[PDB]
Amino acid sequence: LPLKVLMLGDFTGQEDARPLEQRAPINVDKANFNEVMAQQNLKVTLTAADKLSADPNATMNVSLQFKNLNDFSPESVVNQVPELKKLLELRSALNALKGPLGNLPAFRKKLQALLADEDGRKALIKELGLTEETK
Amino acid sequence: LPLKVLMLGDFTGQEDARPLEQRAPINVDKANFNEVMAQQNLKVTLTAADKLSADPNATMNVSLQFKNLNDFSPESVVNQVPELKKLLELRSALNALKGPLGNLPAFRKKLQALLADEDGRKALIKELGLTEETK
Amino acid sequence: DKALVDAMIAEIDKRLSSQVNEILHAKEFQKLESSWRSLKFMVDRTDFRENTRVEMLNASKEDLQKDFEDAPEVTKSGLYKLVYSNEYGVFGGKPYGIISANYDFNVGPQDMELLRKCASVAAMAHAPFIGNAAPEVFGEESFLKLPDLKDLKSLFEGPQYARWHSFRESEDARYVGLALPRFLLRLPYGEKTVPVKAFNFTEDVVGHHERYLWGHASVALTSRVADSFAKFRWSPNIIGPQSGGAVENLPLHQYEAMGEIQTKIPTEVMLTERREFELSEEGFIGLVFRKDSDNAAFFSANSTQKPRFFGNTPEGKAAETNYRLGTQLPYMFIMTRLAHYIKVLQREQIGSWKEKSDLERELNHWLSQYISDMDDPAPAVRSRRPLRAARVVVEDVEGQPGWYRCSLQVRPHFKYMGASFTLSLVGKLDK
Amino acid sequence: SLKFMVDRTDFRENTRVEMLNASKEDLQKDFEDAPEVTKSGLYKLVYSNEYGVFGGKPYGIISANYDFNVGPQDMELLRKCASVAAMAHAPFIGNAAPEVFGEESFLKLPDLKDLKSLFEGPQYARWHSFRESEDARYVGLALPRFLLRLPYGEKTVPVKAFNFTEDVVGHHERYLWGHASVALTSRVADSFAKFRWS
Amino acid sequence: SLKFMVDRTDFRENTRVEMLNASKEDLQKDFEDAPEVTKSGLYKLVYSNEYGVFGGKPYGIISANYDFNVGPQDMELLRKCASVAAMAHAPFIGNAAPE
Amino acid sequence: PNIIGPQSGGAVENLPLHQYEAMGEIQTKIPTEVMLTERREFELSEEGFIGLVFRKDSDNAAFFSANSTQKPRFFGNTPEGKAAETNYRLGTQLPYMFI
């Protein structure tokens, strides 16, 4: 007789409509753990304090999705949050410029692409443009 | 020989017209208790002090109906009392607004729907509108 | 800004909660709820797989009197019809074990008359009638003033209890049993202890404990009968913390006191041993609360009937012993089941070739089935075999061939129900 | 915490685990909804689909990823889990919340002068009765949590591109604490992996 | 003197102590006021709330922080404390005054 | 029961001391008002008092016995009479009443 354990817990961001007797158990092992997460489909709709500005009334709502544990890394969090993703794109633009990897014409073309995102606040665009060296 | 008990009592809000010898007993068990309540059909027509205002002469008459024991919960009491149900709808409108889950245009549209109920007193509508933030 | 919106929510729920308290604390509302909630509390603590059954019969006390007063005799009452006639007195049917009435009784003449009729019914079909007593029966506003009563025995001397005193002397009183204080059914609504959906409701119990959803103790006693039967198919094990008269898992409610914390007692009061004993003497079934727990117990189940006193002689004391056994429900339940078995099994035998001594032989072999006449039967095993000894005599109905007169006398095992101890220090005691 | 469990087991040693998504609230919903435990949804695929099925297999143990308080709902949930565990002969393991000891977090355990005296209060009336039940043998609760992740750092735990340095404030709740019940579950797995007994 | 007592005990060994503020004068007041000892205030939470309560616990002993003279009031107080102690099987200990 | 002896557990240890000038010498204020002699202790015991005696030149005191207030009864000097006296005397002493 195998030793089978049953792990019961809130693995999702929400309760299911399906009755307890109807929802089914999932067999997990080392060779399909990630596959289980991908199939389970994880999602978080939550609001955090917007600290990209200086307003106490500013709030940020995010919709994160996970397929594997790697999707909980700050790198994936940024990629799924446009308000941070654009700032990371800005970061890459400024490091490229400062290391002389691109000329001014390419820099200005890429900058406009970054700041074109209609989901950005104008307050954030201003803080991003304020990081650009005068030259 | 089974051990059968007879529970005699006032299970309804009113006496029956049917003679005692004519009205029939109901067999109850764990697998039909709720079904028995649903079939029995419970109703309460009663008046309580109206404490939604500041008038000693204000009284509230309610007509509650029960199908199961869950229908005695405050959640079902509110749902069957328009004078409270509208206040709960108001509650949900204000929490949605304060958590920024809906914009001002939707808020005002929903507010008018809530307060449109012709069974509401104008005194209650005024107390409900007084809870709306100025903005 | 949102802080002000939250304050609006606080005041909104404050007002909504003030109104909801009115409905939840409505006497009409609580009468309905407590009836059905107390009913399920009974039902779900039974086991229907153990041949336990329950039926509901909607009737008010007023209409009980209406029917019994309307009828020319009890044998023609509506209640008699489907307690006795449709059950015990029907070939192929089944007898009602017991009747649980969800009522409170006062000393009022109507209430006393109702008890008289229920005693007669119960006697005719060999099943006890259990209910509860109202607070005002003891001339107090609620059960919370039981501690203030200096002497119940003297209280019942007043002219006010003239009818109740006569009732206790009737031979039918053996089939009545009334319980004392009520008990909590529901813990008050709270964001933590008993939350509701959406609406942030916090029930506010005032100074009046009547705001609490009190339940009829008669149901708790009915679960005692059910458990004893479920285990043994007999109902004598209902009078002890360990015997099976213990009521476990009572609602608790911790709240602020004078700067400290205390829990609302599951029963209105914390009955002392002396006060319980006083109530027992006055033929009440007091559900006592085990201090600092969620457990209560029925120390005894005396019927309404008052014991008779006899001359202090060998025969006189034997008369007292026999009469006292009759006055207690734990022993009457044995006779009730015996009466039900005899009625059924004997109807099957009608038409058979039975001479006088044939009945004595067969009846003797039958009764032995429930006898445990060993030197020392395992304690509480005696439970499945309640009897220790029994005697049967059969005579002939002279001038009526085929008819017999049978006498059945039984000696049940005794319940431990009190003792006096004499302590003494001593030198040169035998080792 | 689930993977932390999973990857410390050995599936070649006849060890198996299943996941069943359920919140504490809906556990109570099901157990209160059902007329009896034998008809609960959880009973159905712990007992009925396993131990009580010819050709099937019995569940070894149940690990619940929950924190319990002294709250009446939590106590009732434990009562039902004790009954389930008793019927199919498998223990129910979980964790206790900090507030169970009347403290804000486990970091004030050193300040508690006497736990035995603390549990005398009326607040723990139901918990005290629970410990006396014959079903209590199939309940096991763990105390303090434990770290799952070391805070992000350019050296100790670097990320790509973005030079992220996680800043844990004064509140240790910023740390990714994990349910100790999993750590206890790995103990059961190791004993079984070596001996086929726990 | 109370702490001197308290800190020389061991509460881990199932030892408990309660304080009940009462003067000798009011002890007599209560015992004289009551029709019988069974209805005295002291009887109520020595015997009634303890020894005579299902689920409760009995008081081991009573320590009274008093000095007694040969005075009739003091003798009557001792009489009542003897009766209480007898009913709930716990001794009453106190002190005697020099006089 | 172990409350009536220097070794049995009726010993009171660690009493306050106070050395002060006498008639040109030094002496300590006795922890108890007096230094009770064996004869005087025994006298007090006969009168049903519990005398805490002071161990001379130390900070230790002891309760040699814990007789109650009750006075022992005398019986006829016979086998049965002396047995009655034995039994009654056991009742009069607290070390046995605690049992």
Spatial strand arrangement across the major sheet of chain C: 2-3-4-10
Fraction of residues in β-strands of chain A: 15-25%
Can you count the beta strands of chain C? 14
Mind summarizing the main beta sheet of chain C?
A: 4 strands, parallel
Please state the structural category of chain A: alpha+beta
Number of helices of chain A: 5
What radius of gyration of chain A results from the CA coordinates?
21 Å
Order of helices and strands of chain A: EEHEEHHHH
Strand-residue proportion of chain C: 15-25%
Rough outline of chain C: globular
Quaternary form: part of a larger assembly
| Major beta sheet summary of chain A | 2 strands, antiparallel
Structural class of chain C: alpha/beta
Organism (chain F): Myxococcus xanthus (strain DK1622)
Protein name (chain F): Type VI secretion protein
Protein name (chains A, B): Type VI secretion system-associated protein
Strands, helices and their partners?
This is part of a larger assembly, with two copies of chain A (135 residues) and four copies of chain C.
Chain A: E1 3-9, E2 26-28, H1 33-40, E3 42-49, E4 59-66, H2 74-79, H3 82-98, H4 104-115, H5 122-129
Antiparallel strand pairs in A: 3-4
Chain C: H1 2-24, H2 27-43, E1 52-58, H3 61-70, H4 78-88, E2 96-105, H5 109-125, E3 129-133, H6 152-155, H7 162-167, E4 176-179, E5 183-184, E6 214-215, H8 218-232, E7 246-247, E8 254-256, E9 261-263, H9 273-281, E10 284-285, E11 287-289, E12 296-298, H10 314-327, H11 329-349, H12 356-367, E13 387-396, E14 404-412
Parallel strand pairs in C: 2-3, 3-4, 4-10
Antiparallel strand pairs in C: 5-6, 7-12, 8-9, 11-12, 13-14
Helix pairs in contact in C: 2-8, 3-5
